[PDB]
Amino acid sequence: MRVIVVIVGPSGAGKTTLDELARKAKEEVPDAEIRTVTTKEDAKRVAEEAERRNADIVVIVGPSGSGKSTLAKIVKKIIARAGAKTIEVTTEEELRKAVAKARGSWSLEHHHHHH
């Protein structure tokens, strides 16, 4: 399957977080597509690209939901219809839950009642 990591960047969520994220992710997931967005158009771009290569899992990375975050839900809206699961691994302790909700759930969905 395909993996993607999208981030609110090169400004919005931080100034080194998106960088160590792209580095660490592409190192553990050299198959995946790691990118950032700063506006409605970059969200549209990265997502309308991910639906071409069919990103089975789309881990979005951002601060928290209020308004500066809209780019994260724009990408999630483009890929939710594309046919995949999309999540928002925020800077809060809820990071663990958000990651588990898809990067955990996916291998839990495509497996079976035996081993």
Short mmCIF file of N, CA and C in Angstrom, two decimals:
data_model
loop_
_atom_site.label_atom_id
_atom_site.label_comp_id
_atom_site.label_asym_id
_atom_site.label_seq_id
_atom_site.Cartn_x
_atom_site.Cartn_y
_atom_site.Cartn_z
N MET A 1 0.84 -1.23 0.00
CA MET A 1 0.00 0.00 0.00
C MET A 1 0.86 1.26 0.00
N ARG A 2 0.27 2.44 -0.28
CA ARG A 2 0.98 3.74 -0.29
C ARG A 2 0.72 4.56 0.98
N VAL A 3 1.77 5.27 1.41
CA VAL A 3 1.77 6.15 2.58
C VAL A 3 2.16 7.57 2.16
N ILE A 4 1.59 8.57 2.83
CA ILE A 4 1.89 9.99 2.64
C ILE A 4 1.90 10.67 4.01
N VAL A 5 2.76 11.69 4.12
CA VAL A 5 2.76 12.61 5.25
C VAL A 5 2.69 14.04 4.70
N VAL A 6 1.61 14.75 5.04
CA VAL A 6 1.46 16.17 4.66
C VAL A 6 1.60 17.06 5.89
N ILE A 7 2.24 18.22 5.78
CA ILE A 7 2.52 19.10 6.93
C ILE A 7 2.13 20.55 6.64
N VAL A 8 1.60 21.29 7.61
CA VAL A 8 1.42 22.75 7.49
C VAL A 8 2.79 23.45 7.55
N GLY A 9 3.31 23.87 6.39
CA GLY A 9 4.68 24.37 6.18
C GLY A 9 4.88 25.02 4.79
N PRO A 10 6.01 25.71 4.52
CA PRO A 10 7.20 25.86 5.36
C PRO A 10 7.03 26.80 6.58
N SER A 11 5.85 27.40 6.76
CA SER A 11 5.44 28.14 7.97
C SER A 11 4.03 27.72 8.40
N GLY A 12 3.80 27.66 9.72
CA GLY A 12 2.46 27.50 10.32
C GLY A 12 2.47 26.63 11.58
N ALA A 13 2.96 25.39 11.47
CA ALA A 13 3.10 24.47 12.61
C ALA A 13 4.44 24.61 13.37
N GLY A 14 5.48 25.17 12.73
CA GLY A 14 6.81 25.40 13.31
C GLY A 14 7.87 25.73 12.25
N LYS A 15 9.16 25.71 12.64
CA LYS A 15 10.30 26.04 11.76
C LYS A 15 11.37 24.93 11.62
N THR A 16 11.28 23.86 12.42
CA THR A 16 12.15 22.66 12.34
C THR A 16 11.34 21.36 12.41
N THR A 17 10.16 21.38 13.04
CA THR A 17 9.24 20.22 13.15
C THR A 17 8.94 19.56 11.79
N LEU A 18 8.50 20.32 10.78
CA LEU A 18 8.22 19.85 9.42
C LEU A 18 9.43 19.20 8.72
N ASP A 19 10.61 19.64 9.12
CA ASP A 19 11.90 19.27 8.53
C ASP A 19 12.34 17.91 9.06
N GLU A 20 12.47 17.80 10.39
CA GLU A 20 12.72 16.53 11.05
C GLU A 20 11.62 15.51 10.74
N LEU A 21 10.38 15.97 10.53
CA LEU A 21 9.27 15.12 10.10
C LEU A 21 9.52 14.54 8.70
N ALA A 22 9.80 15.37 7.69
CA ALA A 22 10.12 14.89 6.35
C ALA A 22 11.32 13.94 6.31
N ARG A 23 12.39 14.28 7.06
CA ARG A 23 13.60 13.46 7.24
C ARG A 23 13.27 12.10 7.85
N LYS A 24 12.76 12.07 9.09
CA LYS A 24 12.43 10.83 9.83
C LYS A 24 11.43 9.96 9.09
N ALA A 25 10.32 10.53 8.60
CA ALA A 25 9.32 9.82 7.80
C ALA A 25 9.97 9.22 6.55
N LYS A 26 10.55 9.98 5.61
CA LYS A 26 11.14 9.36 4.42
C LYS A 26 12.23 8.31 4.75
N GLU A 27 12.98 8.46 5.85
CA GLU A 27 13.89 7.41 6.34
C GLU A 27 13.19 6.10 6.76
N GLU A 28 12.13 6.14 7.57
CA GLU A 28 11.36 4.94 7.96
C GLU A 28 10.35 4.45 6.88
N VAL A 29 9.95 5.33 5.96
CA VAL A 29 9.00 5.11 4.86
C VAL A 29 9.50 5.69 3.52
N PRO A 30 10.57 5.11 2.95
CA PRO A 30 11.17 5.52 1.68
C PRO A 30 10.24 5.31 0.46
N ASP A 31 9.13 4.60 0.66
CA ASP A 31 8.03 4.43 -0.29
C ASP A 31 7.08 5.65 -0.35
N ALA A 32 6.93 6.31 0.79
CA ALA A 32 5.93 7.34 1.04
C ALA A 32 6.19 8.68 0.33
N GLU A 33 5.21 9.58 0.36
CA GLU A 33 5.39 10.95 -0.16
C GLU A 33 5.25 11.98 0.97
N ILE A 34 6.34 12.67 1.30
CA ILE A 34 6.36 13.67 2.37
C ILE A 34 6.46 15.09 1.80
N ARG A 35 5.47 15.93 2.11
CA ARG A 35 5.39 17.33 1.61
C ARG A 35 4.72 18.30 2.59
N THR A 36 4.81 19.59 2.29
CA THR A 36 4.17 20.65 3.08
C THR A 36 3.27 21.57 2.24
N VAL A 37 2.34 22.26 2.92
CA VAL A 37 1.38 23.21 2.34
C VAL A 37 1.22 24.42 3.25
N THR A 38 0.96 25.56 2.63
CA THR A 38 0.88 26.86 3.33
C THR A 38 -0.41 27.65 3.05
N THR A 39 -1.19 27.18 2.08
CA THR A 39 -2.38 27.83 1.52
C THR A 39 -3.32 26.80 0.89
N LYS A 40 -4.56 27.21 0.62
CA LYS A 40 -5.62 26.37 0.02
C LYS A 40 -5.17 25.67 -1.27
N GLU A 41 -4.30 26.34 -2.02
CA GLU A 41 -3.76 25.91 -3.30
C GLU A 41 -2.70 24.84 -3.16
N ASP A 42 -1.81 24.96 -2.17
CA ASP A 42 -0.81 23.95 -1.86
C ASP A 42 -1.45 22.71 -1.28
N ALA A 43 -2.49 22.88 -0.47
CA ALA A 43 -3.31 21.76 -0.03
C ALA A 43 -3.97 21.05 -1.20
N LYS A 44 -4.56 21.83 -2.12
CA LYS A 44 -5.16 21.28 -3.33
C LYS A 44 -4.14 20.51 -4.16
N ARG A 45 -2.96 21.09 -4.41
CA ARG A 45 -1.80 20.56 -5.15
C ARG A 45 -1.30 19.23 -4.58
N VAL A 46 -0.83 19.23 -3.33
CA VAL A 46 -0.33 18.01 -2.70
C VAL A 46 -1.40 16.91 -2.66
N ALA A 47 -2.66 17.26 -2.41
CA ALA A 47 -3.71 16.24 -2.38
C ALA A 47 -4.12 15.72 -3.78
N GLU A 48 -4.38 16.61 -4.73
CA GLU A 48 -4.64 16.25 -6.12
C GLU A 48 -3.45 15.52 -6.77
N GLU A 49 -2.25 15.56 -6.16
CA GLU A 49 -1.11 14.70 -6.53
C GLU A 49 -1.19 13.32 -5.87
N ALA A 50 -1.49 13.30 -4.57
CA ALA A 50 -1.68 12.06 -3.81
C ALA A 50 -2.79 11.15 -4.36
N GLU A 51 -3.84 11.71 -4.97
CA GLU A 51 -4.92 10.89 -5.56
C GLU A 51 -4.55 10.30 -6.93
N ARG A 52 -3.42 10.73 -7.50
CA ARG A 52 -2.86 10.19 -8.76
C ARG A 52 -2.08 8.90 -8.50
N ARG A 53 -1.25 8.92 -7.45
CA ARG A 53 -0.43 7.79 -6.96
C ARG A 53 -1.14 6.94 -5.92
N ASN A 54 -2.33 7.37 -5.50
CA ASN A 54 -3.29 6.63 -4.67
C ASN A 54 -2.73 6.33 -3.28
N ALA A 55 -2.50 7.41 -2.53
CA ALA A 55 -2.06 7.37 -1.14
C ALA A 55 -3.06 6.65 -0.22
N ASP A 56 -2.88 5.35 -0.01
CA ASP A 56 -3.76 4.53 0.84
C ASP A 56 -3.91 5.09 2.26
N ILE A 57 -2.84 5.72 2.78
CA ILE A 57 -2.83 6.36 4.10
C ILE A 57 -2.20 7.76 4.02
N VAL A 58 -2.90 8.78 4.53
CA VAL A 58 -2.50 10.21 4.47
C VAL A 58 -2.49 10.86 5.86
N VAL A 59 -1.31 10.78 6.50
CA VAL A 59 -1.04 11.39 7.81
C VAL A 59 -0.80 12.89 7.62
N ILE A 60 -1.79 13.71 7.95
CA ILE A 60 -1.65 15.17 7.96
C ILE A 60 -1.05 15.61 9.31
N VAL A 61 -0.20 16.63 9.32
CA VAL A 61 0.52 17.14 10.49
C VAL A 61 0.29 18.65 10.59
N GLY A 62 -0.25 19.10 11.72
CA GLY A 62 -0.58 20.50 11.97
C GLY A 62 -0.74 20.82 13.46
N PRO A 63 -1.07 22.07 13.82
CA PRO A 63 -1.12 22.51 15.21
C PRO A 63 -2.34 21.97 15.98
N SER A 64 -3.52 22.50 15.66
CA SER A 64 -4.84 22.24 16.25
C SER A 64 -5.93 22.92 15.41
N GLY A 65 -7.18 22.48 15.48
CA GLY A 65 -8.27 23.02 14.65
C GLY A 65 -8.84 24.35 15.18
N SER A 66 -8.68 25.45 14.42
CA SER A 66 -9.36 26.73 14.70
C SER A 66 -9.53 27.67 13.49
N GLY A 67 -8.57 27.71 12.57
CA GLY A 67 -8.62 28.54 11.35
C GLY A 67 -7.31 28.59 10.55
N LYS A 68 -6.18 28.81 11.23
CA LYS A 68 -4.82 28.66 10.64
C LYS A 68 -4.56 27.25 10.07
N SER A 69 -5.37 26.30 10.53
CA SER A 69 -5.35 24.86 10.26
C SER A 69 -6.15 24.44 9.02
N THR A 70 -6.88 25.35 8.35
CA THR A 70 -7.82 24.98 7.26
C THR A 70 -7.14 24.14 6.16
N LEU A 71 -5.88 24.41 5.85
CA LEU A 71 -5.12 23.68 4.84
C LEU A 71 -5.09 22.17 5.10
N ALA A 72 -5.01 21.78 6.38
CA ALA A 72 -5.04 20.38 6.83
C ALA A 72 -6.39 19.71 6.48
N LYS A 73 -7.52 20.37 6.79
CA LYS A 73 -8.85 19.86 6.40
C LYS A 73 -9.11 19.93 4.89
N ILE A 74 -8.52 20.88 4.16
CA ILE A 74 -8.61 20.94 2.69
C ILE A 74 -7.97 19.68 2.08
N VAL A 75 -6.73 19.34 2.47
CA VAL A 75 -6.09 18.09 2.00
C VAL A 75 -6.93 16.87 2.39
N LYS A 76 -7.38 16.80 3.66
CA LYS A 76 -8.26 15.72 4.14
C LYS A 76 -9.55 15.60 3.34
N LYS A 77 -10.16 16.70 2.89
CA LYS A 77 -11.34 16.71 2.04
C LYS A 77 -11.03 16.19 0.64
N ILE A 78 -9.89 16.56 0.05
CA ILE A 78 -9.50 16.04 -1.28
C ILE A 78 -9.22 14.52 -1.24
N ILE A 79 -8.63 13.99 -0.17
CA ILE A 79 -8.26 12.56 -0.11
C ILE A 79 -9.36 11.68 0.51
N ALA A 80 -10.25 12.24 1.34
CA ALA A 80 -11.38 11.48 1.86
C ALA A 80 -12.30 10.94 0.74
N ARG A 81 -12.49 11.74 -0.32
CA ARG A 81 -13.23 11.36 -1.54
C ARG A 81 -12.40 10.56 -2.54
N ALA A 82 -11.07 10.70 -2.49
CA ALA A 82 -10.16 10.00 -3.39
C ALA A 82 -10.17 8.48 -3.16
N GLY A 83 -10.55 8.07 -1.95
CA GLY A 83 -10.76 6.66 -1.59
C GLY A 83 -9.84 6.13 -0.48
N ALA A 84 -9.29 7.01 0.36
CA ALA A 84 -8.31 6.67 1.40
C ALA A 84 -8.70 7.21 2.78
N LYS A 85 -7.93 6.81 3.80
CA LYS A 85 -8.06 7.32 5.17
C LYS A 85 -7.00 8.37 5.45
N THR A 86 -7.47 9.46 6.04
CA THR A 86 -6.70 10.67 6.31
C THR A 86 -6.86 11.07 7.77
N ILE A 87 -5.75 11.44 8.41
CA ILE A 87 -5.73 11.72 9.85
C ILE A 87 -4.93 12.99 10.14
N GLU A 88 -5.10 13.56 11.33
CA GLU A 88 -4.48 14.83 11.74
C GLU A 88 -3.72 14.64 13.06
N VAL A 89 -2.42 14.34 12.97
CA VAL A 89 -1.56 14.04 14.11
C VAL A 89 -1.02 15.36 14.71
N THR A 90 -1.87 15.99 15.52
CA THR A 90 -1.65 17.30 16.15
C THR A 90 -0.51 17.29 17.18
N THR A 91 -0.07 18.48 17.60
CA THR A 91 1.02 18.68 18.57
C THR A 91 0.67 18.29 20.02
N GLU A 92 -0.61 18.12 20.34
CA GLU A 92 -1.11 17.64 21.65
C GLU A 92 -0.77 16.16 21.93
N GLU A 93 -1.00 15.70 23.16
CA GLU A 93 -0.89 14.28 23.55
C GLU A 93 -1.79 13.34 22.71
N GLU A 94 -2.86 13.88 22.13
CA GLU A 94 -3.74 13.22 21.16
C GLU A 94 -3.04 12.74 19.87
N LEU A 95 -1.77 13.14 19.63
CA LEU A 95 -0.90 12.61 18.57
C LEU A 95 -0.96 11.08 18.50
N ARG A 96 -0.77 10.40 19.63
CA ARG A 96 -0.78 8.93 19.72
C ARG A 96 -2.09 8.33 19.20
N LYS A 97 -3.23 8.90 19.61
CA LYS A 97 -4.58 8.49 19.18
C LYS A 97 -4.76 8.72 17.68
N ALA A 98 -4.43 9.91 17.18
CA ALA A 98 -4.54 10.25 15.76
C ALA A 98 -3.71 9.33 14.85
N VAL A 99 -2.47 9.02 15.25
CA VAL A 99 -1.60 8.09 14.53
C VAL A 99 -2.23 6.69 14.53
N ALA A 100 -2.65 6.23 15.71
CA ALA A 100 -3.28 4.91 15.86
C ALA A 100 -4.56 4.75 15.01
N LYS A 101 -5.38 5.81 14.89
CA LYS A 101 -6.63 5.87 14.11
C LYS A 101 -6.49 5.56 12.61
N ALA A 102 -5.28 5.60 12.05
CA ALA A 102 -5.03 5.15 10.67
C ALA A 102 -3.71 4.41 10.45
N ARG A 103 -2.55 4.96 10.83
CA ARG A 103 -1.26 4.25 10.71
C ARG A 103 -1.23 2.97 11.55
N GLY A 104 -2.10 2.88 12.57
CA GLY A 104 -2.37 1.63 13.30
C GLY A 104 -3.55 0.86 12.72
N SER A 105 -4.69 1.53 12.51
CA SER A 105 -5.94 0.90 12.08
C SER A 105 -5.79 0.19 10.74
N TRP A 106 -5.06 0.74 9.77
CA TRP A 106 -4.94 0.19 8.42
C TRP A 106 -4.49 -1.28 8.39
N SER A 107 -3.41 -1.62 9.09
CA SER A 107 -2.93 -3.00 9.19
C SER A 107 -3.86 -3.87 10.05
N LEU A 108 -4.67 -3.24 10.90
CA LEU A 108 -5.73 -3.84 11.70
C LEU A 108 -7.01 -4.12 10.88
N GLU A 109 -7.22 -3.41 9.76
CA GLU A 109 -8.37 -3.56 8.85
C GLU A 109 -8.14 -4.63 7.77
N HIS A 110 -6.95 -4.62 7.15
CA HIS A 110 -6.62 -5.49 6.01
C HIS A 110 -6.14 -6.89 6.43
N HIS A 111 -5.88 -7.11 7.72
CA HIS A 111 -5.63 -8.45 8.29
C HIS A 111 -6.95 -9.20 8.60
N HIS A 112 -6.87 -10.44 9.07
CA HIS A 112 -8.00 -11.36 9.26
C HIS A 112 -8.09 -11.94 10.69
N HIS A 113 -9.16 -12.69 10.98
CA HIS A 113 -9.49 -13.26 12.30
C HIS A 113 -8.53 -14.35 12.83
N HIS A 114 -7.43 -14.64 12.13
CA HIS A 114 -6.43 -15.66 12.49
C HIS A 114 -4.99 -15.19 12.19
N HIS A 115 -3.99 -15.90 12.72
CA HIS A 115 -2.55 -15.65 12.51
C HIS A 115 -1.72 -16.94 12.58
#
